[PDB]
Write an enzyme that holds these catalytic residues in place. Structure first.
Site, short mmCIF file in Angstrom:
data_model
loop_
_atom_site.label_atom_id
_atom_site.label_comp_id
_atom_site.label_asym_id
_atom_site.label_seq_id
_atom_site.Cartn_x
_atom_site.Cartn_y
_atom_site.Cartn_z
N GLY B 15 16.74 -6.40 16.67
CA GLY B 15 17.73 -5.34 16.66
C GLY B 15 17.20 -3.98 16.31
O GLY B 15 16.02 -3.84 15.97
N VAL B 16 18.07 -2.95 16.38
CA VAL B 16 17.64 -1.60 16.04
C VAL B 16 18.12 -1.17 14.62
O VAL B 16 17.51 -0.26 14.05
CB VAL B 16 17.95 -0.53 17.11
N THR B 18 20.83 0.00 11.20
CA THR B 18 21.44 1.29 10.82
C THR B 18 20.29 2.27 10.62
O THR B 18 20.39 3.44 11.02
CB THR B 18 22.40 1.20 9.61
N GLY B 20 16.15 1.15 10.53
CA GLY B 20 14.97 0.82 11.33
C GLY B 20 14.99 -0.43 12.18
O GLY B 20 15.87 -1.27 12.02
N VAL B 22 14.32 -4.01 13.56
CA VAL B 22 14.20 -5.30 12.89
C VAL B 22 13.47 -6.29 13.82
O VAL B 22 13.98 -6.62 14.89
CB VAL B 22 15.52 -5.84 12.30
N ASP B 131 31.22 -0.67 6.73
CA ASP B 131 30.63 -1.15 8.01
C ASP B 131 30.48 -2.72 8.09
O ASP B 131 29.48 -3.30 8.53
CB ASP B 131 29.29 -0.43 8.35
CL LIG Z 1 21.34 -3.59 17.84
#
Ligand SMILES: [Cl-]
Ligand SMILES: Nc1ncnc2c1ncn2[C@@H]1O[C@H](COP(=O)(O)O)[C@@H](O)[C@H]1O
Ligand SMILES: [Cl-]
Ligand SMILES: [Cl-]
Lengths: 287, 366, 161
Positions: B15-16, B18, B20, B22, B131
């Site tokens: 993933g991207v 919140t 950096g 991952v 969130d």
């Molecule tokens: Cl993502």
């Protein structure tokens, strides 16, 4: 050095401070009549004093203050107690006793009981050394209520089984008692000169019918009836226990805590009593 | 010469985040897989989000709950800041709902108890993960929920509210979307409220392709309840999805709820404000500062409606402080609130505050 | 282990990294998605490096350079001790109308037959806040709930004005 002495010596004052309490502070400049009314309207037997000029807690206002004012300045049922109605707290404290005793929350319950007896006091303000503010007011009742939790679960020593009589705890000599017909003014007088907290009320027959106490006195403030002290003690108690010499210290303690009362009248074989035992005496005998 | 952080050979980017990137890390020797948040110091230097990342690190550090993705380590290099965490094979609870259907009443509850469990632990530590969405709720091999992005999380303060209106529009509470300041946990309950809807229904309770109309839907607090839904769960949603925060369910209110109670595993859980003035907000600030100056008190101006006032004790020669924040009650009224600023002995802090406050009230309006 | 990530946000089919730290030998950068990357543990100190990007040597113009007395332009990196402590590294990286009153400040524990000197656990959000009673017989009453450790104390000052 009993087990209780070592038990009180181990626990901090903080431990007794409830999860969320109310604290009422009075500036010394506040009117003395307002001060007493506030005690009632907030529902608190005492309140610490704050000298705004000195920037420190210089003492405490209790019902004892009311008893001393109400007696010193009662002219009559026809003339309003001027002094009380127009005095400041600082002006009255100037009249009486011409310093502030406290404890740290991180101090032992032993040092707390020691202080109560040593200084001959009922109220002990717990004041934080870090902040400088009062958190809670430590009473004999609270301390004994907690100590009770220990002895109900912990095995009782030989002296707890013994009788009040043979153990010799509590005052049994020169017991200040009032009569049914005795007025509130005379009663206040006795409270002042004898330095006692309560007075048993005897019948014309001689059997103890009731008991007048420092706490009963606040109903004069509450019901705004303080201006006439000529009323009989019984006429005052119109708004609203015992123990035997032979009984065990254990049985006596259980009664004091359960009833949530501050003393017990010590009766002989009859209605007429031989003496009085107090929470102070119980706690002095365990520390 | 494969990219690796120690014995963890880095792999696919899952993933991207919140903050950096991952990536996965399968251990050279033990085959143990970890998730690695790579915060690029070249990008973090850029803003003043430096705080928002020291917040994520600090908060997450001391936590250890069964339904919160664990922080194994945080290692700083000249290049980047790595956050080694526990890795889970099941990915997004969101993708599970997409791929499989809506979850059955039993399953829906099972997972809800877990998400609420984690959410409770958070609040119990004065941390509030703003969130909260199924996109940030991960599943493991035997699909136990795991809370994951604490980038938008924040530390709750004694006597203080929070503004940052953050999180995905759908899952964001009415007071959040509105921009009004909140206490903290109300917000996560409203998010956990929609999570439960998405669990039992497979759809969102407030949804629209036009953002402002969606915002109205959220604030209207009105959403669909399919016939397949149990009336007991409907009542719980009705409570968690209350538009007014003072009427909204509390974790206690949920723990007390019969639907939530059923088959619950035991491992999961153990007089008026200030002075009001009808004057102009600028005129009030004007009225107050000339009154502060009168009392010779020093002060500093934060917001135009926020002042930090200090006072030298003329007797004990010690400093006492307070926070003065102007609010708005009515469409016509304004309220000035006095908060204490606890320092870090000769005269009480608490009473010195009252005195500092009373001295001002002595001259100010209503 | 604290390794330094080298990135090549350029294009290219094959990219290598030559440095003082590896004795100027062509180390291949692995193409991530966006950049070509390599992670090496580098000790505290000054280190010069360069890139072999599709048979052409260059520095990263984005990263600091160093021109030699001989004309060679290399990139440079200073690995400081500060680059290892997570919070020490955080500091080095640093370098209209009033709000509507939140509903939580309207709930008073003094307003809402046990102990009269006993109150409920207050919501953290109203601690240190000033709540006062209407000025009566020239006496102003002020209150605030404050917490000492796991205990809360609501102090009431009876002040003449
Ligand atoms: Cl993502
Ligand atoms: N009616 C009384 N007569 C004499 N002494 C008393 C009386 N009531 C209490 N005391 C004593 O006063 C001391 C302090 O108790 P108290 O003022 O009741 O808290 C103890 O030694 C009690 O026994
Ligand atoms: Cl694999
Ligand atoms: Cl797994």
């Amino acid at each position: 050095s009993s087990v209780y002495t070592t038990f009180m010596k181990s626990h901090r004052c903080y431990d007794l401070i409830p999860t969320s309490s109310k604290l009422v502070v009075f500036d010394t400049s506040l009117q003395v009549k307002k001060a007493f009314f506030a005690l009632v309207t907030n529902g608190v037997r005492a309140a610490p004093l704050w000298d705004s000029k000195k920037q420190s807690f210089v003492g405490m206002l209790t019902i004892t203050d009311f008893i001393n004012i109400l007696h010193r300045y009662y002219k009559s049922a026809l003339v309003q107690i001027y002094e009380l109605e127009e005095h400041k707290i600082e002006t009255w404290r100037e009249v009486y006793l011409q310093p502030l005793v406290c404890i740290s929350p991180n101090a032992s319950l032993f040092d707390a009981v020691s202080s109560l007896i040593r200084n001959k006091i009922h109220r002990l303000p717990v004041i934080d050394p870090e902040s400088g503010n009062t958190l809670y007011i430590l009473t004999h009742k609270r301390i004994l209520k907690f100590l009770k939790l220990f002895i109900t679960e912990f095995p009782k020593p030989e002296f707890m089984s013994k009788s009040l009589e043979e153990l010799q705890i509590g005052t049994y000599a020169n017991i200040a008692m009032v009569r049914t017909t005795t007025p509130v003014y005379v009663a206040l007088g006795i409270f002042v000169q004898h330095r006692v907290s309560a007075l048993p009320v005897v019948d014309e027959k001689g059997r103890v019918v009731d008991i007048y106490s420092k706490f009963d006195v606040i109903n004069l403030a509450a019901e705004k009836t303080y201006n006439n002290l000529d009323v009989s003690v019984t006429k005052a108690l119109q708004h609203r226990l015992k123990c035997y010499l032979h009984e065990t210290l254990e049985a006596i303690i259980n009664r004091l805590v359960e009833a949530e009362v501050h003393r017990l009248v010590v009766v002989d074989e009859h209605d007429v009593v031989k003496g009085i035992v107090s929470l102070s005496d119980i706690l002095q005998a365990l520390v | 010469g494969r990219v690796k952080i120690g014995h963890y050979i880095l792999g696919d980017t899952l993933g991207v985040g919140t903050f950096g990137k991952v990536k996965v890390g399968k251990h050279e020797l033990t085959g143990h897989k970890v998730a690695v948040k790579i915060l690029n110091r070249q990008k973090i230097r850029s803003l003043d989000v430096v705080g928002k990342i020291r917040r994520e690190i600090q908060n997450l550090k001391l936590f250890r709950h069964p339904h919160i993705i664990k922080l194994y380590q945080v290692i700083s290099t000249p290049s980047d800041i790595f956050m080694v965490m526990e890795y889970v094979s099941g990915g997004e609870l969101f993708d599970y709902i997409c791929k499989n259907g809506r979850l059955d009443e039993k399953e829906s509850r099972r997972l809800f108890q877990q998400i609420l469990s984690g959410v409770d632990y958070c609040h119990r530590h004065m941390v509030v993960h703003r969130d909260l969405k199924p996109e940030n709720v991960l599943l493991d091999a035997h699909m136990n929920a795991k809370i994951a992005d604490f980038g938008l999380s924040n530390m709750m303060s004694d006597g203080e509210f929070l503004r940052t209106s953050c999180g995905s529009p759908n899952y964001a509470a009415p007071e959040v979307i509105s921009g009004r300041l909140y206490a903290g946990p109300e917000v996560d309950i409203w998010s956990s409220g929609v999570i439960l809807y998405a669990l039992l229904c497979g759809t969102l309770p407030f949804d629209d392709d036009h953002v402002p109309t969606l915002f109205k839907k959220i604030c209207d607090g009105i959403f669909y309840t399919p016939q397949y839904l149990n009336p007991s769960v409907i009542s719980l949603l009705k409570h968690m999805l209350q538009v007014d925060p003072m009427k909204r369910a509390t974790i206690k209110d949920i723990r007390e709820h019969e639907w939530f109670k059923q088959d619950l595993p035991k491992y999961l859980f153990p007089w008026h404000l200030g002075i009001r003035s009808q004057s102009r907000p600028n005129d009030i600030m004007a009225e107050v500062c000339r009154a502060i100056k009168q009392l010779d008190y020093e002060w500093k101006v934060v917001n135009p409606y926020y002042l930090r006032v200090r006072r030298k004790n003329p007797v004990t020669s010690t400093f006492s402080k307070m926070s003065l924040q102007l609010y708005q009650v009515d469409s016509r009224t304004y309220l000035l609130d006095f908060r204490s600023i606890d320092d870090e002995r000769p005269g009480s802090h608490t009473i010195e505050f009252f005195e500092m406050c009373a001295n001002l009230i002595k001259i100010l309006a209503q | 282990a604290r390794p330094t990530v080298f990135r090549w946000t350029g294009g290219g089919k094959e990219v290598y990294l030559s440095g003082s730290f590896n004795n100027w030998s062509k180390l291949p950068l692995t193409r991530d998605q966006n950049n070509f990357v390599a992670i090496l543990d580098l000790p505290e100190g000054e280190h010069q490096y360069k890139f072999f990007v599709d048979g052409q040597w260059t520095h990263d113009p984005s990263e600091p350079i160093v021109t030699s007395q001989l004309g060679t332009v290399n990139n440079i990196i200073q690995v400081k001790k500060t680059d290892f402590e997570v919070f020490d590294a955080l500091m080095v990286d640093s370098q209209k109308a009033p709000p509507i009153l939140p509903p939580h400040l309207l709930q008073v524990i003094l307003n809402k037959s046990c102990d009269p000197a006993l109150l409920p656990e207050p919501n953290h959000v109203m601690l240190n806040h000033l709540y006062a009673l209407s000025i009566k017989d020239g006496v102003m009453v002020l209150s605030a709930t404050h917490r000492y450790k796991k205990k809360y104390v609501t102090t009431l000052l009876y002040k003449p004005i």
